[model samples]
Target chain A: YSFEQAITQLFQQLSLSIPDTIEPVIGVKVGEFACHITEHPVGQILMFTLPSLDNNNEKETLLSHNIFSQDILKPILSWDEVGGHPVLWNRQPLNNLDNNSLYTQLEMLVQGAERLQ
Target chain B: YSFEQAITQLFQQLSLSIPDTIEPVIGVKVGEFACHITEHPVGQILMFTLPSLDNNNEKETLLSHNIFSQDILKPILSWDEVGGHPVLWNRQPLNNLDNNSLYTQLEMLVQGAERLQ
Candidate 1:
């Protein structure tokens, strides 16, 4: 399928699993993380942030967590400290879109985020 | 740097470590892998394939190795069986390009491939 088509399907699949009160178009909370999907020039990215870790006092912990997360999630999703928050993100290319793999990785991210929380 | 700029710089840095006989524009050999960089519709991707594993007889082993590689490289580089060869690849978006992180991951891939060989 095309990148757009796969992304659309992904949204549909995600919507089914999430509650009606939460809209994926805006963002969804999975465990303790707030997840959002956005389009980029190269493709699309799924970004999730831990709101609790957004405090300035947690900056040190955030950096440590990012490294720990990367050790486990490397090659699939990346962890970063964005605007004082610990953000985990994954990018998928527009060309050669692998819908199955993309979905699988998304699930993995969800699981990892849940496990981390 | 822009996505194109980062990619160019990545090539420049890579060229310094590799022999002049091999041009990155074409491809480079790293240990047992054949590495190439290409632009995708969304961004750029660095792909490396294990040529020795490009055999019909090695299909099962290729799959196993892909899983092993993914377990080790996850969140940074992905492994897949493409055209009967085990390939590892990473994509960087054109927007919000992180040159340092990208270069770091590329180095990780090189080291990982070398270690696996």
Candidate 2:
């Protein structure tokens, strides 16, 4: 299969493992974080988003208050902000594509985010 | 072994596989590109460098002439420049560390750069 086809299939498989409270069209929620696959001009990215700690006083919604630092997060994912929320993302090129590697990265991201919640 | 220890060991192992034309402390050269492991404040980065096409008129030294595009390169590596040379780099956090995964990324970067030569 082509890179895009394999990625989309992987996303579909992952989406099935999460609860269906939110539609998969939007994204899948694993614990307090929402994860999705975005098609960018540069490449396809696996992105996870959670609300910023400052905006939401709720315990479950607090993401990246003082818990995250460059030292802790820089190796696994690229950090960014979108609409006041914190996002963690990654992309893999065709030559580097490995299903196990991609899955392991997502697992680490999800575990890290969940540990702080 | 701890993450840092394992990473250092992996680098040592990889260094042995490359040619010895240049000192390993400085970095290794694969084809026309120079590759090294840099210890960054955030994490350890595997970096590859080549002279920009605009600087060197030699056919073998030309890197990223008109061959590279964001779409083609963005997935596997982060692109940057230092001392007027183009660099491709990647970093993996402890939780995401897998020797095979790291080796494959470096392989892809080297292959991509070599193809343009």
Candidate 3:
């Protein structure tokens, strides 16, 4: 799917659940991906597109961990990726759990986004 | 200082310390800022320049957190920025401590960079 469609489905679903201050400025371009953290020294969600995984921009979008200096992007529910840090949903660790869906990721994104304001 | 000088001093000192397997590809452009995590999801250091803080590329370089959808960049030692998560040095928590130096930050960068291999 196109970037527009991807974000629409991902973010639009969280429309009501997300707070008022938490606004999104989704870019269809590069680092193109970005978010805001209202709270400091707290858990935040950072997601970006992986050029290596989806160079052609198919419907299957790959998400990268917060760690930089490397190319470690995988599907939303991937467990082997390790992600530099543990899986955290809403500031709490998902522990060794797997099967994280798009909604869970969006919740974490919203949780961090709300902390900014 | 120029981006060239900025990375030169930051990553240069990390030259001997940072392993050979990991390489630094500093970008003078936009997300322009990037790094290699090396490992799956362990701990990675992601540092980027902030356009709002140093629009003209001044000597005072601002470092941003990994969380996207936000603009959270500050000096290497800034504690007020509340960068999504607490200060983690070499994967361990720095706790409520302050006075984080440039070299310490680089150490985290190297630690995470090495994890990839």
Q: lDDT per residue, candidate 2, A59-112, as tens digits?
A: 212211222233322222222322323444444433344655445545666665
Local distance difference test scores for all models: 0.43, 0.42, 0.29
Clash count for each candidate, listed in order shown? 12, 1, 29
What local lDDT does model 2 show for residue B38? 42
Which has the better lDDT: candidate 1, or candidate 3?
1
Regions of candidate 2 where Cα sits further than 4 Å from its true position = A1-4, A15-26, A41-44, A51-82, B1-45, B48-117
Q: Is the docking of candidate 2 incorrect, acceptable, medium or high quality?
A: incorrect
lDDT, candidate 1, residue A65?
Answer: 29
Question: Candidate 3, overall lDDT?
Answer: 0.29
- Worst window of 10 by summed lDDT in candidate 2 chain A: A59-68
Q: Which residue segments of model 3 deviate by more than 4 Å? A: A1-40, A43-117, B11-105, B113-117
lDDT string, candidate 3, A2-115, tens digits = 222334444555452333333333422212223321222233323423222222321111112221212222212111133432121122112222334334544444443332
Instruction: Enumerate the candidates' DockQ scores in order.
Output: 0.04, 0.05, 0.03
Better of 2 and 3 by DockQ: 2
The candidate, 2 or 3, that scores higher on lDDT is 2
* TM-score for chain A in each prediction: 0.51, 0.49, 0.23
Cα displacement (Å) at residue B62, model 2: 34
How do the predictions measure up, each by TM-score?
0.38, 0.38, 0.24
The CAPRI classification for model 3 reads as incorrect
